[PDB]
Amino acid sequence: LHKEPATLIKAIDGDTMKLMYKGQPMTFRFLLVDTPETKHPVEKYGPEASAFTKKMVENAKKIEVEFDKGQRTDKYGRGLAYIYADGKMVNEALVRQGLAKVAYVYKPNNTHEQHLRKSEAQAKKEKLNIWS
Numbered sequence: 001l002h003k004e005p006a007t008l009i010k011a012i013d014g015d016t017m018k019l020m021y022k023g024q025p026m027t028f029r030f031l032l033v034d035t036p037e038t039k040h041p042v043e044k045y046g047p048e049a050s051a052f053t054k055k056m057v058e059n060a061k062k063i064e065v066e067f068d069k070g071q072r073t074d075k076y077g078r079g080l081a082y083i084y085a086d087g088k089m090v091n092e093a094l095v096r097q098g099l100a101k102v103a104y105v106y107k108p109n110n111t112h113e114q115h116l117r118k119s120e121a122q123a124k125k126e127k128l129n130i131w132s
């Protein structure tokens with residue numbers, strides 16, 4: 001895998017955002033996690049996950065996207081990637097806080113699964129947020 005540059009256009013919610021990628025606006029959806037819904041057609045911690053993500057990416061110097069080794073988009077046309085804000089993976093950061101659960105694990109796009117699962121285990125052992 002490798003990291004590629006992108007530019008933040010707009011934070012959407014905990015696990016989805018608009019980025020400029022190779023000169024084109026796209027929706028990206030984080031691999032391997034699910035944050036609570038803000039706009040369910042509010043779930044608890046939805047607002048908190050959205051705010052955490054928005055702050056992390058809006059404050060960043062540099063945003064990067066890292067595709068996994070399979071599909072790079074979902075059926076909605078969303079980019080599927082690990083997003084990094086100044087070198088810190090946002091997907092992992094949310095899970096470490098108990099603001100996302102590890103979810104949507106679709107092979108072959110599961111390279112960081114164990115990593116995320118170990119963060120989730122710690123967040124649950126610390127009883128944070130979703131696990132409180």
Ligand SMILES: Cc1cn([C@H]2C[C@H](OP(=O)(O)O)[C@@H](COP(=O)(O)O)O2)c(=O)[nH]c1=O
Nearest residue numbers: 016029030031032033034074075080104106
């Ligand atoms: C994270 C992820 C979601 N999805 C699909 C599964 C879910 O489909 P359905 O909409 O049919 O349930 C939806 C969840 O995204 P959201 O969590 O943004 O709604 O996106 C993928 O296909 N690949 C992925 O890697």
Ligand SMILES: [Ca+2]
Nearest residue numbers: 015034035036
């Ligand atoms: Ca979600």
